[PDB]
Amino acid sequence: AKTLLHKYSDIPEGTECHRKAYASTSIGGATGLIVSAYSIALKPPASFLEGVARTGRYTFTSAAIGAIFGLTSCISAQVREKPDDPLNYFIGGCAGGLTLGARTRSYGIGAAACAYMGLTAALVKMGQLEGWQVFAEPKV
Amino acid sequence: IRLQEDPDPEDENLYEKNPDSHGYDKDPIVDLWNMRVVFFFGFSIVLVLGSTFVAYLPDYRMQEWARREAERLVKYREANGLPLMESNCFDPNKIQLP
Amino acid sequence: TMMSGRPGRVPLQFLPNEARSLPPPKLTDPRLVYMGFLGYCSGLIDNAIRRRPVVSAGLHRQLLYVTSFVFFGYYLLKRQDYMYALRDHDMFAYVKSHPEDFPEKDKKTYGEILEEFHPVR
Amino acid sequence: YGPLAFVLGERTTRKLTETSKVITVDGNICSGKGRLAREIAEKLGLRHFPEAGIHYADSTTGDGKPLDVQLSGNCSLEKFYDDPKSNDGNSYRLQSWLYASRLLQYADALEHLLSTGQGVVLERSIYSDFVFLEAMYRQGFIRKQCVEHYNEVKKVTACEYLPPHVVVYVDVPVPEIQSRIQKKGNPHEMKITAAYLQDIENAYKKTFLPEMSEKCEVLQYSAREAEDAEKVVEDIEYLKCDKGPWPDQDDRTFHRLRMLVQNKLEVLNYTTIPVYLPEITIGAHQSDRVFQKFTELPGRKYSPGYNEDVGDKWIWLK
Amino acid sequence: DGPEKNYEKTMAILQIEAEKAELRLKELEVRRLMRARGDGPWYQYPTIDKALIDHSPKTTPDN
Amino acid sequence: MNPIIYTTLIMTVMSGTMLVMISSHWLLIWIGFEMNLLAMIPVLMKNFNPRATEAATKYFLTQATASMMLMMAIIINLLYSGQWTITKMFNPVAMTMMTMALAMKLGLSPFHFWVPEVTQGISLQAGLLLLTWQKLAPLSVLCQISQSINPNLMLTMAMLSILIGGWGGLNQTQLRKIMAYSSIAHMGWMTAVLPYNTTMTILNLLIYITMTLAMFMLLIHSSATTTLSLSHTWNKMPVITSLMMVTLLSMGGLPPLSGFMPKWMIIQEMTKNESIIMPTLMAMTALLNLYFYMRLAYSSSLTMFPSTNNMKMKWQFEHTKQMKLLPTMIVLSTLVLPMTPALSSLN
Amino acid sequence: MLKIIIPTTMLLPMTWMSKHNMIWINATVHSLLISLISLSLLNQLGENSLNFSLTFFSDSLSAPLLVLTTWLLPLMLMASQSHLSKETTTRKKLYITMLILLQLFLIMTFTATELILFYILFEATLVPTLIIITRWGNQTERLNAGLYFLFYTLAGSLPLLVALVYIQNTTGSLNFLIIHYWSHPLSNSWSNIFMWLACIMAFMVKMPLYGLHLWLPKAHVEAPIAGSMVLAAVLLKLGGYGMMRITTILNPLTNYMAYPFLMLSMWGMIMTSSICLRQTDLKSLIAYSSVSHMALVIVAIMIQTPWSFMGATALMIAHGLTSSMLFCLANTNYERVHSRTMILARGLQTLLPLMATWWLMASLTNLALPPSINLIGELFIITASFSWSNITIILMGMNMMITALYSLYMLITTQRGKYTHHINNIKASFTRENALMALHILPLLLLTLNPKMILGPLY
Amino acid sequence: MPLVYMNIIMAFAIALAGLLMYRSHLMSSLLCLEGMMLSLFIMSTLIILNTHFTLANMMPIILLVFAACEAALGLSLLVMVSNTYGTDYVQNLNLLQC
Amino acid sequence: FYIREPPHGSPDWLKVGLTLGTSVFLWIYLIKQHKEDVLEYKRRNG
Amino acid sequence: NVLQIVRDHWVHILVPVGFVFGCYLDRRSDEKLTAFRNKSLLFKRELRPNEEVTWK
């Protein structure tokens, strides 16, 4: 888990966009595989081929979302020359949401996913810049 | 669909049972006393006495005190040649500027 | 877990003997009065549930509610005061025994400190 | 009585004796079953419960005096006799209320039997109440959904009770019943048709009596035969006790039954099942108004013993 | 009442509240240091009691 | 079931929990868990129904799996430490296995699936015990090992528990399932502060126990298991449904009711440790629980539903069974907020 | 401060232990007495606030609001006597107790010295309000309205709780005096930006900012008369008071973070006034007018100039009174025709003459007619915003024009024209309704003689 | 660690996976439970014997006792399901949803 | 009035007396405990 | 009868008694805040004879 996280974060912002996109794609693929496994367990497919198809669809959707997010964020950082601006991550998240809508073939899903994902990615970038702790070590 | 009472007729005018109603309740005596209580404690007490109390409230905002202090200060400044109002809310001799 | 592992703490003891050095909560304490109020409300709800006159039926039962609530509230408040006194005592002792971690800071008056002025235009 | 009493040693099997039986005297409308039931109760020494009517619950609760129709029952047998196909649902509402009244009656009877030990002689029973409902449905007075609701309610309440040891049925024929009704005097009863009584008899002889005979003995008597109380009593005194599931009862199930029958609200728990039939579904405003009217009755506001208006005192220390 | 009564009451209230704030910050720092070091009366997680050890001649000489 | 036998089984459940909360040996904690399961299964099946048997089987399977994982964790900790005492576990893998086992026992998501089913299958009397008393032992074990708990895993489980409890509670019309999902959300709330301050977990547990005791006893006093059946209670007994509305508002975490105490103190402790995103998300997700509580309050008291004609007979009779603790549990679960500084007594 | 809190609490046992023929009378008597006693709180000092004790204090901002609440409770009782006349005694007592609890909670919010106690009570005000709206509302939309209102408020306020606890942990105290003296500038970091938002959005939801205002029309339309009265008079000013109290620790980030909210309010005033121009429901029109009026208070608070704060306080008091009276008039019309459609009943100027005068005066106050305190507040805010930026005057003037337009349009539509022929149930107005309108109007007109009282602590 | 420890831990893991993955019968799930119990017994016994923890040699026997107690619990639940449904198929346990 | 005598009926003087005695005993014990605590607190400090 | 009047309108005395009790409580609270009674550099003055406190 943290291996992929450090394979993505150690790549500096606005540098090696291909490798950054690959790392984001790997993270998305792992998330999609987890979701596919849970869906198969809770909602069993009728056939093995159906399960393989469901896993492939979910994994491809998640990996495409991750790849598009990474490419968009890195390209924005490169072009705008602003590696430490959350707007890059916002654009990447909205692009990922648009790709999610395209995969699901729904404009409303695309727009809602663009908005929420962009907000969440901007929040993640702000937390990285400032030092926000999602899981804070017990300090008292 | 259900055994339910028919919608009650629109609220019966209290003028019907007693032409002098003042609104409020249905009993004429309690109507009269509720009207007396409302009018008294609303207009004669908390309105009249309230406005008089808030009109003669002692000057704790210190407006007259501020005006008198300003008059004294202006007298001192003009009589002694001081330039009325200074240009520093605090004395520079007590400021350790970097 | 903070106070659970304090040295000398006797397990399953509601009030340690060292707590007696603290002043007991006054019987006119507002917290104790609120405990009595909770007991009275419990009595009223008991009357309401059993469909009896809420404010008059079973005066002995409501009295027992109030007495039990006041008794347990008094002991509970005594324990709470003891625990807060323990917390303050331990904090003061730790500060005293660790001067380096809590050093006195240079006292600079506002005439010396430079705080930036942000205008409101 | 409670779990503590059962633990301490109070067991109902000690109280049961030769005459610790529940007897239901059944029959068609105005078949004279009431006199037979009373005569059985007098000679066998058992307690007699007159057939539960609309205001039976009023007798057990409060002053024992009937309440207003708006409050206790919201139904009329006379209206059913006059107009059996009314659009107010009075027919099925009356049938459901009578089933609830007989369910309470059966509970009181079983309680009395399990506590005092004295036997019980009831007129008809929840097990025999379905005859009227089936007759109403066959006549067309009530629709199928009402029958479905009645079956749903019955299958959840009757299962928790033991069927009567003896089922005494009077078999007065339909024309004789018609003659008695036309000579009884009540015009509303005179308004009863012939197919209604015929369907009552058909249900009694096709479903109730065979099913009861499957469980226990079913004594049967004609009009002449039922007039000899000694003959009917002698038959009960020599019936094979193997009949009925009562011999298959131990103190455990008896404890369960005695706990159930003492809590009337638990007895009537599934009577008010939330099935929104238009015939019984009382609206929110009417429900509120009628409940407020009931709460304002003397002694019906607070729990029994805490109503100061009806002479109850010491409430401050009570 | 006089304007000085509210003045002195405000001074007392400010003193009490400032003491409360300083004590709260002090308590937070003390708790953090005690949890980080475990050298105080708080956060003393239990360890094995040494009174259970049996200091008696065992079977094997090398104990 | 004989009342003597039922009392012995209840005392065996309580003795198992006390063995878990009293021993200093891991083997005895596992023994107490086993006794709790053994004496809980027949208590679940006191009233014999196919649904009761299904609930008992599912609960037994889940608790058996959890106990096996817990014993494996204990054995691994012994292997890597040679210690049986309940202390700082000396193996990370054993710690993870024990955390999974204890979360499965508590019903923390994604081990939440059995709770709505087992709770619905059993009666209200057994459901109260399952949702109140059965949470004591695993929470006590977690509080004893809070130092060795990996904060990330516990926080993820707590957040998922809150989310899933809220989401599940919205689609439920059966009261028992609503209570089960609310219990899942509150268990997540309790386990959120375990790595930070265990006294806040104890406070939340006490408040939740009082609220759930009040709610289940009100349901028993109304003999209602569905929203429609509970709706009729406004006609027979408006006091019960009004108190139920108040208790639901308290469970939502609305001030000045007592349900605000645990959430407020938990947010305080989590902000003291520089965690600001997690408590904010938890507070925002509590709104789903508040939603379904409000929906129930509407259907029960805030709005009046159509009753049935047969309630007229029920109006005459008074309840015979008397739960002596119900008024106290209602009061303690609604009007104890002015008494938070009593937190120190739990230290 | 307990001189007002204790009698407010004692109102509950009084009403519960009073005869069924005397709940309203006793409630009115003693609520009016409580207001008379609370009038003594207006004797504010020039510089220092009235610090009664460690828990409660009052300055020239808290006192007018406290007086408004204590004065509005009797008015709510008088307005709610009518429709709650066929209700059972227990439910009437319950409604009165809900009103009393709301008033008590409002008093303890306006007097609290601790930000967290203020938050606790200001969120505790939800429960009596929600119950009142969802239990005694007439329509079927009262259930959705209660949810919208409750969830908008909670989603706004929970981050405020988080931020307040964080500030307590970092600064050591949440007391208003200490947090005011020990104030420190906020940096431009993202963390400070989100703390600023968490502190601001909670009160932005309360006084409805354009965009977060959707709950106000539903709440004001579906709730009973008394509920609408509180929601319009005090529950909206709660957000303004909280914002004016918390803006002390939100500087200087406000200078840069206020732009979105300033633009939102300065456009939403025009949008909501235009919406009022094309409304078909009287209560909805009044609610949108309330939104438009509170937009000015939002602007004034977000500008942070002394004239802006004075105008904000004056507008809060004036708008509370005017909106409460307008809702009462609409309630009378509704109780007469049993419908809230504005075009349903017309030509009421010929059937109810004195009610027409009440409508005229209320509309004149609503459109900020000089020298009413409404105009005092509006003009102070307009001058403050003009000093902030000269361009603001265009929007301010357009808003004033549209407000006058829709207020006079309401007056013409309701109290003018040809009477509705078929309507025959319009009886002569009772003494109670006229007394309610008089008690709404007379303090409002008298405050223009002593405007210093409601001009806030910066006067 | 010695390879025997690895084998026993792997056996426990396999039994756990088997129990978590039902197919049709409830009997096989109880078999996997008993297998996990046996694996834990072997693990604990090897650990105790290897470290010469004499006083802890009674732990595996207690584990076995509670193991067969759980087995008896499972068997009784199995008979009730069969009595109520005719088969011990795990799919019959379907009334309780969510 | 009632055909069936009320289950509560005439007051259970045993239960009422027990409740009153318990309440009085609790009050007396509380007062004595408070007095002892005050005396001990004064003794341990002065 | 007089007793009828009081037994029917005893509730008209709660809130006035409440106000009295609240004023007393406010005075009691003011008592426990006399930490700077006469020790403020602005209002600190010598007590006049036969004046133990300035009540501040």
TrEMBL record, chain A:
Gene Ontology BP annotations: mitochondrial electron transport, NADH to ubiquinone
Predominant location: mitochondrion
Highest taxon of source: Eukaryota
Residue ranges of the TM segments: none
Keywords on record: Membrane, Mitochondrion, Mitochondrion inner membrane, Transmembrane, Transmembrane helix, Ubiquinone
InterPro entries (UniProt xref): NDUFA11
Disulphide bonds in the chain: 17-74, 94-114
Location within or outside the cell: Mitochondrion inner membrane
GO CC aspect terms: mitochondrial inner membrane; respiratory chain complex I
Membrane topology of the entry: Multi-pass membrane protein
Family to which this protein belongs: Belongs to the complex I NDUFA11 subunit family.
Name this polypeptide is given: NADH dehydrogenase [ubiquinone] 1 alpha subcomplex subunit 11
Species, as recorded: Sus scrofa
Gene name tied to this protein: NDUFA11
From TrEMBL, chain B:
Family: Belongs to the complex I NDUFB11 subunit family.
Stretches the record annotates as Disordered: 1-22
Gene name per UniProt: NDUFB11
Compartments where found: Mitochondrion inner membrane
UniProt-recorded name of the protein: NADH dehydrogenase [ubiquinone] 1 beta subcomplex subunit 11, mitochondrial
Residues of the full protein shown: 53 to 150 of 154
TM ranges: 37-58
UniProt keyword list: Electron transport, Membrane, Mitochondrion, Mitochondrion inner membrane, Respiratory chain, Signal, Transit peptide, Transmembrane, Transmembrane helix, Transport
Membrane topology reported for the UniProt record: Single-pass membrane protein
Organism this protein belongs to: Sus scrofa
Complexes and interactors: Complex I is composed of 45 different subunits. Interacts with BCAP31.
Function: Accessory subunit of the mitochondrial membrane respiratory chain NADH dehydrogenase (Complex I), that is believed not to be involved in catalysis. Complex I functions in the transfer of electrons from NADH to the respiratory chain. The immediate electron acceptor for the enzyme is believed to be ubiquinone.
From TrEMBL, chain C:
Keywords: Electron transport, Membrane, Mitochondrion, Mitochondrion inner membrane, Respiratory chain, Transmembrane, Transmembrane helix, Transport, Ubiquinone
InterPro entries: NDUC2
Intracellular or extracellular location(s): Mitochondrion inner membrane
Membrane topology reported for the UniProt record: Single-pass membrane protein
The keyword Electron transport appears for this protein: yes
Entry's Gene Ontology cellular component terms: mitochondrial inner membrane; respiratory chain complex I
Domain of life: Eukaryota
Membrane spanning residue stretches: 61-77
Pfam families the record matches: NDUF_C2
A Gene Ontology biological process term: mitochondrial electron transport, NADH to ubiquinone
Function according to Swiss-Prot or TrEMBL: Accessory subunit of the mitochondrial membrane respiratory chain NADH dehydrogenase (Complex I), that is believed not to be involved in catalysis. Complex I functions in the transfer of electrons from NADH to the respiratory chain. The immediate electron acceptor for the enzyme is believed to be ubiquinone.
Family, similarity comment: Belongs to the complex I NDUFC2 subunit family.
Official protein name in the record: NADH dehydrogenase [ubiquinone] 1 subunit C2
Name of the gene this protein is made from: NDUFC2
Automatic annotation (TrEMBL), chain J:
Listed transmembrane segments: 9-25
Subunit (UniProt): Complex I is composed of 45 different subunits.
Membrane topology: Single-pass membrane protein
Cellular component aspect of the GO annotation: mitochondrial inner membrane
Full-protein interval shown: 51 to 106 of 106
Name by which UniProt lists this protein: NADH dehydrogenase [ubiquinone] 1 beta subcomplex subunit 1
Record keywords, A-Z: Electron transport, Membrane, Mitochondrion, Mitochondrion inner membrane, Respiratory chain, Transmembrane, Transmembrane helix, Transport
Organism: Sus scrofa
Keyword set includes Transmembrane helix: yes
Annotated compartments: Mitochondrion inner membrane
UniProt similarity note: Belongs to the complex I NDUFB1 subunit family.
Tree of life domain: Eukaryota
General function of this protein: Accessory subunit of the mitochondrial membrane respiratory chain NADH dehydrogenase (Complex I) that is believed not to be involved in catalysis. Complex I functions in the transfer of electrons from NADH to the respiratory chain. The immediate electron acceptor for the enzyme is believed to be ubiquinone.
